[PDB]
């Protein structure tokens, strides 16, 4: 809590307008799986492109000339 005669400012690490702690915990639990699956999707998206680049590069070495 930071209070000034001009303004009042509250520094918090998490906030919610629903006034309920339980719904905040439920929201955190819901967001956990969402961020986990987002990270997995990003990893697989990068890996597919890496495999495609490797396959493309192999053909130059195959073509010895």
């Amino acid at each position: 809590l930071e209070v000034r005669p001009d303004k009042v400012t509250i520094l918090a690490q998490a906030a919610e307008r629903a006034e309920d702690i339980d719904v905040l915990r439920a929201k955190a639990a819901k967001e956990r799986a969402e961020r986990r699956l987002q990270s997995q999707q990003d990893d697989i998206d990068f890996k597919r492109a890496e495999l495609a680049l490797k396959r493309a590069m192999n053909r130059l070495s195959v073509a010895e000339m």
């Binding site: 930071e2 400012t9 520094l11 690490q13 955190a28 967001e31 961020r35 987002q38 990270s39 990003d42 990893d43 990068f46 492109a49 890496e50 495609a52 680049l53 493309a56 590069m57 053909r59 130059l60 073509a63 010895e64 000339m65």
Partner: protein, 283 residues
Amino acid sequence: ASLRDIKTRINATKKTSQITKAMEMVSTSKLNRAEQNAKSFVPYMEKIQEVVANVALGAGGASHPMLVSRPVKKTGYLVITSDRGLAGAYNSNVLRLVYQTIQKRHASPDEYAIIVIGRVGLSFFRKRNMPVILDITRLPDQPSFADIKEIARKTVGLFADGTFDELYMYYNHYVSAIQQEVTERKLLPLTDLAENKQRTVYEFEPSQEEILDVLLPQYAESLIYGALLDAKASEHAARMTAMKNATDNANELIRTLTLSYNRARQAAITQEITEIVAGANAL
């Protein structure tokens, strides 16, 4: 060589150039989003810094352990590295600098502990049998404060337990889309601090000594979060630059291939016409 071989080589390098261009575009878009993601953090930091500067720098306040430099017995290290490659010497510079500093100024395995972020750094430090105490991997492209909280508070508590007396941070600072620099920053015991131009006394409640115990760890965690965001931005920029360089190299090679293509094309005809004429002249 052979005309068909030259044609196949040209096709292959064209395919590689196209793939590299697509990767460059993707990296550019990701960096564009990451810039706004990093920018969205200013007000909280600019307020907490002012509050800490106003509170700590007044009527002494040196009784807190996190404000006095006790004698050094153990040292900590924090390293921030990416999880995926194709970024150049981004990880190599930081790893080399950290290794050189440790080897220069420690010369003993029991004088330090290492905390790392990223699979590349984790593997690099495990290959040398160096001691690692904490590590987290597989972070999202645009992480939030909800994933670094546990490791940040664990590090703060580890320092508060007296395991080590000081630690430093090593990461890349995003200067420009083409320039990135490695920086070393001292996190705690925060012996050096700057005061605000305007300061006002506060009515402590319930106690000035009790306020600092809750105030300080949030400041440290905010510093760590800002450093992580900067590192992510620098990584994206480096990846984009590397992809652009690869495209340029392939485009350079194509024409040098085409010249020999043309020479072989002329040679084939000049051989075949002479052969036909010589065969016809026999009768």
